[PDB]
């Protein structure tokens, strides 16, 4: 029912197995399959596979933050049909495959920040497309985000793409995102941007902005100074984006 | 001389140029060369080169924490002779070269944690052979032991949260002042008893006769776990009785 290092709190017909900061080397196999909240954060589990979370139908909240997971097997979360939140932050993941995130069909929160993700498959989020309300891919090495998947989530209200290496933002990626309230693009490799609407919150500070005529539409907006800086042309290098007059954006 | 976004505090002939959280894309070139404390943390500077810190003789404290440094040029800190502390944590450094950490001759503290360091040159630290060396939270499989073993003043070595699988027999031999050694969350399966505070939790310990010496020590339970043999897998290292650490001769040359 409860693994030796773990503590189980039985709420009104609801199981919560807490194994946080207990020095685990791998997910314990003696966890009850009736558990709803599985907390495995601050451990040292390096590998996830199919038998770790097999037959767990009613698992709602699974947190695996600040671990040492370098590899996630094909269909590790395959039986997690009720999974509404999945935390995989502060890990060593480099590539996310199509089979890795298969399973949580009603997933609403996906935290994948603080890893070393360089490539994510285009069909990785295909099983949790409609449901996904929050997508966090902060602090990774991402050059290209899977825009086809991220653009097919009608319920997404938060997308954290900050602290990555994204050099291009296409024009069809912002289309069809009605509930999008937050889009963080801080600390990336973006030099140019294309006129995008729905300006209610977009952050783009710490980007190598090319302050010329192509970036004059953005300079005309009523937005706060988030300390955005010009990296090129050399005359504008070092100067704040919101402090340089509109007449100095020449070609 | 003070750069437009930076604030300079002159406290009794002590220049403190603070540029933290200013959204800088690169180290400003209008910084006074007489500065002693240069704070450039929480900035978005991605590249360091030799003209960024040239002619700064009296620079003692240089902090570049939580930035986006992916590359450090050859002899970037070349003229920082007085540099006693260098913070380069929370960055994107993957490989440290021999010429990269050249310059600070009297360096006493070196923080290189939170990066993605996979390889470090053997002669990178050859200029300051240091009191504190931090290489935590990186992807290090092998650290420069020949360099780390040639620092007679080293009192702290943080190797935790890396991928170190082996610890050589004669490295800490020349380390007399070593008081702290963090080895938490690594790939270490076996340890050798070579003394003269050590943490080793979160390692894939092979709990047999080879680690029985460690089990006999009067140490607190830092939640160390056995990964092998299969009978001891999952159980705590400090909870398994000493009689259960059995083995067969290793038969090696
Ligand atoms: C200001 O700093 C300079 C050295 O850069 C020093 O000569 C001067 O005395 C300092 N001013 C005060 C009031 O301490």
Residue numbers in the entry:
A (entry chain A): 16 to 215, 228 to 278
B (entry chain D): 16 to 144, 147 to 213, 228 to 284
Paper passage:
Both the LRRNT and LRRCT subdomains of SALM3 are stabilized by two disulphide bridges; in the LRRNT between Cys17-Cys27 and Cys21-Cys34, and in the LRRCT between Cys238–Cys257 and Cys240-Cys278. Comparison of the SALM3, SALM5 as well as SALM2 dimers reveals highly similar structures with r.m.s.d. values of 0.691 and 0.758 Å for the LRR domains of SALM5 and SALM2 against SALM3 structure, respectively. Thus, these measurements verified that the LRR domain is sufficient alone for stable dimer formation.
The SALM family of proteins also known as LRR and fibronectin III domain containing proteins (LRFNs), represent a family of LRR-containing synaptic adhesion molecules, with five known members (SALM1-SALM5). SALMs are considered to be postsynaptic adhesion proteins, mostly expressed in the neurons and regulate neurite outgrowth and branching.
